[PDB]
Design an enzyme around this catalytic site. Structure first.
Site, PDB file in Angstrom:
ATOM      1  N   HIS A 159      -3.065   0.372  -3.621  1.00  0.00           N
ATOM      2  CA  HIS A 159      -3.971   0.797  -2.552  1.00  0.00           C
ATOM      3  C   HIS A 159      -4.221  -0.356  -1.612  1.00  0.00           C
ATOM      4  O   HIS A 159      -3.745  -1.458  -1.854  1.00  0.00           O
ATOM      5  CB  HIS A 159      -5.284   1.280  -3.157  1.00  0.00           C
ATOM      6  CG  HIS A 159      -5.096   2.214  -4.309  1.00  0.00           C
ATOM      7  ND1 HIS A 159      -5.158   3.582  -4.173  1.00  0.00           N
ATOM      8  CD2 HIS A 159      -4.824   1.976  -5.613  1.00  0.00           C
ATOM      9  CE1 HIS A 159      -4.955   4.147  -5.345  1.00  0.00           C
ATOM     10  NE2 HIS A 159      -4.748   3.195  -6.236  1.00  0.00           N
ATOM     11  N   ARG A 171       0.828  -1.207   0.000  1.00  0.00           N
ATOM     12  CA  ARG A 171       0.000   0.000   0.000  1.00  0.00           C
ATOM     13  C   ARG A 171       0.865   1.262   0.000  1.00  0.00           C
ATOM     14  O   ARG A 171       1.964   1.274   0.544  1.00  0.00           O
ATOM     15  CB  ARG A 171      -0.896  -0.003   1.244  1.00  0.00           C
ATOM     16  CG  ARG A 171      -1.863   1.159   1.341  1.00  0.00           C
ATOM     17  CD  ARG A 171      -2.651   1.103   2.639  1.00  0.00           C
ATOM     18  NE  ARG A 171      -3.601   2.203   2.737  1.00  0.00           N
ATOM     19  CZ  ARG A 171      -4.118   2.673   3.874  1.00  0.00           C
ATOM     20  NH1 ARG A 171      -3.787   2.156   5.048  1.00  0.00           N
ATOM     21  NH2 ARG A 171      -4.970   3.690   3.836  1.00  0.00           N
ATOM     22  N   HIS A 172       0.353   2.329  -0.594  1.00  0.00           N
ATOM     23  CA  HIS A 172       1.021   3.635  -0.542  1.00  0.00           C
ATOM     24  C   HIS A 172       1.215   4.131   0.896  1.00  0.00           C
ATOM     25  O   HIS A 172       0.633   3.591   1.826  1.00  0.00           O
ATOM     26  CB  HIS A 172       0.208   4.667  -1.313  1.00  0.00           C
ATOM     27  CG  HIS A 172      -1.175   4.850  -0.778  1.00  0.00           C
ATOM     28  ND1 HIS A 172      -1.436   5.546   0.381  1.00  0.00           N
ATOM     29  CD2 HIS A 172      -2.369   4.408  -1.230  1.00  0.00           C
ATOM     30  CE1 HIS A 172      -2.735   5.537   0.615  1.00  0.00           C
ATOM     31  NE2 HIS A 172      -3.324   4.849  -0.346  1.00  0.00           N
TER      32      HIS A 172
END
EC number: 3.1.3.48
Lengths: 255, 262
Positions: free
Chosen positions: B194, B8-9
């Site tokens: 995401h 995930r970012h």
């Protein structure tokens, strides 16, 4: 001229829990990190790693919090002439990383001052924590002054002291710190605890001391690396609260 | 061995500082004036002005650091990364860029921006997709993006307000396309996207049955920033299984005290 008081950075025992030593020290006492927010290594303590129980270090993001403050002070061209700090490891480490950010690790020596320790009612334990002495700190790669003679020594600290006691010694040490830096340098940085930001600065304003209830309420408001500033009213002995010379630092958790 | 890594970012400006972080940060003339140490020193300029940031927020300074540490851990574990793909969200591109810096691969690896790695478009507000920054404009703004790369699902093929199993499906197809094109040109692949992407991209790859939307969202909200899952393949079979990540997890708390003072 200017007095900057700020709180230490993120702690290991808060992020990783009361049983955090089980998460990073094995049976043989070897340090084995289990998280990227744990530092690559920890100082050796003259007594073993169970001294960390009462005196936890800052996390890797604690170092960052401090460094960003340091760098922010450099970007605003705010020269620090002396740095004082509480004897807690977390406070020394915070002070050290602020200096890295300041690009002054090899020009300023931190003055470890036991009188800057927090109100001893909030000790999570029966006795005072074993602190790492200045000589042994310097050898752990923290920029401390082994010359420094504390205005209040460790022995002078009363276990489980009272509000009035804490507020009083907070005022004496701040006053003392203010005296011995008048001849030398403009600006002073205290790196200590949430309580320190209120107790050390309350009478500095010339305003009467708030009671313990309204003081606990004021202490819970202060974030990690929370940073306040006082300017001297000419040379009147009273200092007023200024707008800090750097921006505040806010971030959430990992989630 | 051959591994696939999905992460995930990092921490987002609009979560920390809120939907209206723009009103704080940008003055009437459009100048960026940061009001916090967790805001970057500058932000990339955008085609249509700063209002494009509304639905495509950047990461914070701590978000950058999170990505940096993960990159550094990967370098410490001697995990070679041969390809990196990311969602076209600015936050994902920036996360990937800072992973590459920690990895000391900034100037060697070029990130492949792939619209099919974008999250479920039901979570996009309005009836229109974010004004994403194109790869060419991304390179110009100091993010090691591959301008050559041709996406498997371009922007025009993304369905606005798409349904769950459609999202689940295109996540599955894209992962399979990504794996397939990399088979001959190296071993390890990093995908930066995401929260939804961790379960979406890997579920059916392992043969596992996707969860229903309600159970899916619950799982998604537990994944931390830079949360890092991993999949390994048995030789040339096309059979993927979960494995222990080759790096440690990353956990930290909030700044604390009060959010507002004085």
């Amino acid at each position: 001229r200017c007095l900057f008081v700020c709180r230490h950075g993120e702690r290991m025992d808060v992020v990783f829990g009361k049983y955090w030593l089980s998460q990073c020290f094995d049976a043989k006492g070897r340090y084995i990190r289990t998280n990227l927010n744990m530092p690559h290594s920890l100082p050796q303590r003259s007594g073993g790693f169970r001294d960390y129980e009462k005196d936890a270090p800052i996390t890797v993001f604690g170092c960052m919090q401090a460094r960003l403050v340091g760098e922010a002070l450099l970007e605003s061209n705010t020269i620090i002439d002396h740095v004082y700090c509480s004897p807690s490891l977390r406070c020394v480490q915070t002070a050290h990383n602020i200096l890295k950010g300041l690009q002054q690790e090899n020009h300023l020596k931190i003055r470890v001052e036991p009188g800057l320790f927090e109100w001893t009612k909030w000790v999570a334990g029966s006795t005072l924590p074993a602190w790492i002495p200045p000589s042994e700190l310097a050898a752990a790669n923290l920029s401390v002054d082994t010359t420094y003679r504390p205005h209040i020594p460790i022995s002078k600290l009363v276990v489980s002291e009272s509000y009035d006691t804490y507020i009083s010694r907070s005022f004496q040490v701040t006053k003392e710190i203010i005296s011995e830096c008048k001849s030398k340098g403009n600006n002073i940085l205290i790196v200590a605890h949430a309580s320190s930001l209120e107790a050390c600065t309350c009478q500095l304003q010339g305003l009467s001391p708030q009671n313990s209830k309204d003081f606990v309420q004021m202490v819970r408001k202060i974030p990690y690396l929370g940073f306040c500033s006082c300017e001297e009213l000419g040379e009147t002995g009273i200092w007023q609260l200024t707008d800090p010379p750097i921006l505040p630092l806010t971030h959430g958790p990992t989630g």
